[PDB]
Structures are given as C-alpha cells and as structure tokens.
Amino acid sequence: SHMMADLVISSYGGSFQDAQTKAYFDPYAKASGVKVTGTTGTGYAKVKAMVESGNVTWDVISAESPAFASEVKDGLLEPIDYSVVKADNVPENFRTKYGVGYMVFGTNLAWNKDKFPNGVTPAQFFDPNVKGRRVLPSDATYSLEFALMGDGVKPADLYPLDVKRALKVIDRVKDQVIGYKGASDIQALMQQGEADIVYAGTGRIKNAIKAGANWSYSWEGALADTEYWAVPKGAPHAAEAMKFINFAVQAEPQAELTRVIAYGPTNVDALRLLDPAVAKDLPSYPANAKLGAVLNSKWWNDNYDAVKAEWTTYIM
Numbered sequence: 001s002h003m004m005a006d007l008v009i010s011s012y013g014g015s016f017q018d019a020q021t022k023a024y025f026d027p028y029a030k031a032s033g034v035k036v037t038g039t040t041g042t043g044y045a046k047v048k049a050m051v052e053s054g055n056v057t058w059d060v061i062s063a064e065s066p067a068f069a070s071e072v073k074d075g076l077l078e079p080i081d082y083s084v085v086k087a088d089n090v091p092e093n094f095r096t097k098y099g100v101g102y103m104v105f106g107t108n109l110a111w112n113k114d115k116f117p118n119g120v121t122p123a124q125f126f127d128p129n130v131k132g133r134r135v136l137p138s139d140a141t142y143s144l145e146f147a148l149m150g151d152g153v154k155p156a157d158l159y160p161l162d163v164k165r166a167l168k169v170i171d172r173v174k175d176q177v178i179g180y181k182g183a184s185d186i187q188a189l190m191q192q193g194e195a196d197i198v199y200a201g202t203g204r205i206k207n208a209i210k211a212g213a214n215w216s217y218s219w220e221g222a223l224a225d226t227e228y229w230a231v232p233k234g235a236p237h238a239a240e241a242m243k244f245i246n247f248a249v250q251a252e253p254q255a256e257l258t259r260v261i262a263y264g265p266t267n268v269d270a271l272r273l274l275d276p277a278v279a280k281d282l283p284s285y286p287a288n289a290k291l292g293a294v295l296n297s298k299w300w301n302d303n304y305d306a307v308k309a310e311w312t313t314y315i316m
C-alpha cells in the first residue's frame with residue numbers, strides 16, 4: 001500500500017487542530033512522504049451519514065469517547081490493524097479493537113477574570129443570581145455531568161446520570177446561556193469577550209489565555225475524557241490510516257502534542273520528554289482529579305440515543 005492522494009484526517013478545527021497539525025500531521029507527512037490533509041466536522045452523526053452512504057471521504061477521525069462508543073455500536077469503524085499499530089508503551093486499555101486512545105483531556109469551567117475577580121465555582125455557574133453570558137458544550141455529553149456536579153452531585157456519585165435533574169439544573173441559567181457550542185466557537189467567544197463563563201477543553205482555555213484572553217479556570221467540576229484515532233468503515237486509505245495512527249501514538253509526537261496544547265498523552269514514555277510542570281495542567285494530576293470526574297463512556301454507550309433526542313428538543 002501507498003498514498004496516491006492525500007490522507008484525510010477529520011478533527012475539531014481551531015487551536016486543537018493546529019496542535020495536531022504541528023505534532024502529528026506535518027511530522028507524519030515529513031517522515032513518510034504522505035500528503036496529509038486535516039479537515040473538520042468529526043462527530044458520530046457525520047461519521048454515520050458518510051459510512052452509510054458509502055461515500056467515505058475521511059481516512060482517519062479523531063473521536064471523543066461517547067462519539068467513539070456510538071460509532072463502534074453502529075459498526076461504523078474499521079478494526080485497527082495491530083500488526084501495523086505497534087505501541088506497547090500505550091497501555092492496552094487504550095489499544096481497543098476499533099480505535100486507539102491517544103489523548104486524555106479535561107473540560108473545565110473558565111471565567112473572564114475582569115467580570116469575575118473572585119472566580120466562578122460550578123455552583124455559581126448554575127446560580128441564576130450570578131449574572132454572566134454562559135456557553136455550554138454543543139451536545140448533552142459533558143454538559144449533563146457539569147450541571148450535576150454544579151448542583152452538588154459528588155464526582156463518585158455521578159453515574160448513572162440523573163438526566164431529569166441535570167436538565168432542571170441547566171433550566172436555572174438557561175436564559176443566560178448564549179449558546180451550546182463547539183470547542184473552536186468557544187475559544188473564539190472567550191478571545192472576543194463575547195462570553196463571560198464557559199465549559200471547555202483545558203487546551204482551548206489555556207490557548208485563549210496565551211492569545212491574551214484574561215480568563216482563569218479550575219478543575220472543580222471538570223470532566224476528563226479519552227480521545228481516539230479511528231478509521232471509518234470503507235475509508236479509501238484504511239491501510240495508510242493505520243500507518244499514520246502508528247506514527248502518531250509514539251512517545252515523541254505524543255509529547256509534541258502536549259507541548260503545544262494542555263491535553264495529556266496516553267503513551268507512558270511521552271511525559272519524561274516534557275517539562276515536568278505540564279503534569280499539573282492535566283486531568284490525571286491527583287490534586288486535579290479529586291475535584292472532578294472521568295466521563296463514563298459505558299453509560300453514554302447505553303443512553304446516548306435517548307439523551308440526544310431529549311437534548312435536541314431541550315436546546316430548541
């Protein structure tokens with residue numbers, strides 16, 4: 001097998017995609033001689049539509065664990081070729097039949113420092129007396145766990161999610177929620193000063209700060225999740241996709257990703273390559289982990305369809 005066209009990788013755009021281009025896409029292109037083209041739009045609904053039409057234009061996707069669970073459940077993915085993906089320094093739990101866990105990321109409460117000098121706690125985010133333009137994630141995933149922790153549900157007691165309660169909690173501040181947005185849209189709103197309080201990926205928050213946004217954040221009520229490399233069923237360059245995944249999950253590219261954006265590696269040999277201070281900005285850091293929870297992809301696997309049908313009518 002050899003690439004005669006570009007290898008198309010679907011991700012989330014903005015600063016995270018810039019980080020993937022710098023750590024993974026351009027280094028892979030240089031190492032292999034493959035032309036690599038990053039695109040946006042990754043998500044369960046789009047992967048489903050594309051795979052079922054038989055018009056697969058994405059060779060690799062980046063999938064968050066609930067989207068990945070739905071994709072696996074619908075048989076939308078090629079099994080990973082582990083004769084090609086060789087990464088024994090990536091723990092076996094991340095090397096799944098249909099995807100390779102390559103990143104651990106937190107989703108955190110962040111606030112504009114000038115609007116909130118004393119910060120914002122998850123309880124304050126869901127307090128109608130606290131005035132501020134709020135932005136929640138675009139889907140029910142992450143949003144529901146945040147609402148529940150904001151309402152005093154202990155991280156250890158999160159799952160099974162009390163969906164009715166979570167929606168009643170969001171109801172308290174719904175009139176102050178300006179949007180249910182994707183990661184790139186949230187970072188843009190922070191930088192432009194069009195939002196005052198958000199729930200977003202740590203890397204997006206810290207990149208907005210790097211760009212001059214006077215915002216702060218905390219690990220209180222944060223939700224950690226795993227991101228996977230997967231290959232849509234019927235991907236025209238499925239074998240080439242395996243070679244990219246193999247390259248990308250090695251210690252050095254994984255370290256280059258965490259160098260540019262505050263998301264964590266799955267490769268155990270990546271952290272010794274990085275500044276020891278990066279550890280403290282990751283979900284696995286014990287002082288951080290105790291203040292939030294880890295997304296339960298088994299619960300989402302079993303409840304996503306029911307939650308989605310409700311969420312759509314809820315935001316509309």
Ligand SMILES: O=C(O)[C@@H]1C=CC(=O)N1C[C@@H](O)[C@@H](O)[C@H](O)[C@H](O)CO
Pocket residue numbers: 012016063064105107137138139141142181182183184200201203204227263
């Ligand atoms: O793009 C990012 O920086 C981060 C990094 C991994 C990831 O899946 N991200 C997106 C999620 O934080 C989030 O935007 C999610 O896709 C939406 O809320 C819809 O489920």
Ligand code: NA
Pocket residue numbers: 137138139140141142143
């Ligand atoms: Na979401």
